[PDB]
Amino acid sequence: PVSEKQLAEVVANTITPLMKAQSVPGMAVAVIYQGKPHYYTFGKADIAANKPVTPQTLFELGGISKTFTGVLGGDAIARGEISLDDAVTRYWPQLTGKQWQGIRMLDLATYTAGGLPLQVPDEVTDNASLLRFYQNWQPQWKPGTTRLYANASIGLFGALAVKPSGMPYEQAMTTRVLKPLKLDHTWINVPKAEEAHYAWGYRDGKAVRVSPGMLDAQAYGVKTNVQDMANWVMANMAPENVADASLKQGIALAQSRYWRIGSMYQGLGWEMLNWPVEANTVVEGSDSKVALAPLPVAEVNPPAPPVKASWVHKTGSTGGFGSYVAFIPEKQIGIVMLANTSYPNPARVEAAYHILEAL
C-alpha cells in the first residue's frame, strides 16, 4: 500500500544525499516490490565521457559474487556431485598436508577452516603455486571454531565444487546458475561487445577496474547490471518460482544456517539475520572492523534450513565499486544498490534499511 511515485522520492531522498556525502558518481538502484522490480538510476558511469548510469551499466559486485558461488555450490550438492561435509582433500587429493584433515568443504565456504587468509597472495600464479600455498598454510585455529572472512576460503570452495562437473568454473556458472536464471548479462569476463556498458570504478578520484588474481571469479569477479541483479534477488527471495530443480535446492542451501556469529548467520555466500531487526544490528556488523575480524562461531547443527523471516544480505566491494543487496522473503521486499565508489558499508546498510522500511 505505498505508491510507486513516492517510492521514487524515498529512493532519491535517500540515495542522492548519500552520493553527495560519500562522493559516488553513479548508482543503480532496484527496489523489488510486489513481485516486480523498480529501477532508479543516478549518476555517471564514466565521468570524462559523461556517460549516465543506466539499467545496463555494468558494475563490479565484489563480494556479492560469493552468493553466486554458494548457490553454484548448493546446486552441486543437489546434483549429487558434492557434499559439504566431505573433506577438502576429497576434491583436491594433493592437499596431503596433515592440517587439512578435519576440514570440510563447508568450512571453506563459510570461512571456518581455521584462519585461511583474506587474500590469495599475488605471487600465486598457477595451480602449482596454489597447491603450495595451501600446503604451507599453518592454521591459526581449529576448524569450526572461528570465522574469518577470506577469499582463500570460498574461492577454494568454488574451484573445487565444480570439479566433479568436468567443467571450468566460468562455464559451470553460466549453464548452471546464469542461463537458467536468464542472467544473460552477468559476466565473469566482460565481452568486447558489452564493453561500453562497463562503468569505471573510482577510487580517490581515480578511475579503476578490478585486476585479476587467482580465484577471482569465485570470490570477487562477477559483473552485472541492476536488472540482472534484481532478477538474482528475486530468484533468491522466491526460489519456488525457479524451475531448475537443482538450482532451487541450491539457492535454499545457500540461505541455510551453518554458524551464528553474534546476531548473524552464515550461509553459502549469503549472510542472514532473523527478521525483525533493528538497523543498528545490521549496521553494527557491517562495519569492517567486525566483518573482517575473526570471530567465534556457534555451530548450527544440523544446519537450519532457510527462514523466510530473515534479513538476507551481502556487501561487495572492489577498489572502485560498492554494492549491497538485501531482501526479506517473508515480506517479499528487496533492494539492489550498485555503485561506482566503495563507500562505507554501514552507509549502504543504513540506506537500504530506510528504503525498505517504507514498504
Fold of 1-359: Beta-lactamase (3.40.710)
Q: What Å distances lie between residue 210 and 60, 127, 172, 235, 318, CA to CA?
A: 8, 21, 22, 27, 7
Query: How many Å apart are CA 177 and CA 92, to the nearest integer?
Result: 24
- Find the Cα–Cα–Cα–Cα dihedral 108, 189, 122, 219, rounded to 10°: -20
300: number of CA atoms within 13 Å, CB side? 18
* 110 closest CA partner among 69, 79, 59: 69
C-alpha cell of residue 194? 558489452
Residue-range domain boundaries for the chain: 1-359
Query: How many Å apart are CA 342 and CA 206, to the nearest integer?
Result: 12
Query: How many Å apart are CA 80 and CA 99, to the nearest integer?
Result: 27
* 326 closest CA partner among 337, 316, 312: 312
| In contact, 176 and 79? CB cutoff 8 Å | no
Query: How many Å apart are CA 190 and CA 161, to the nearest integer?
Result: 23
Query: How many Å apart are CA 318 and CA 131, to the nearest integer?
Result: 26
String of DSSP letters for 50-116: TEEP-TT-BEE-GGGGHHHHHHHHHHHHHHTS--TTSBGGGT-TT--SGGGTT-BHHHHHTT-SS--
C-alpha cell of residue 230? 534484481
Expressed in Å, this structure's resolution amounts to 2.7
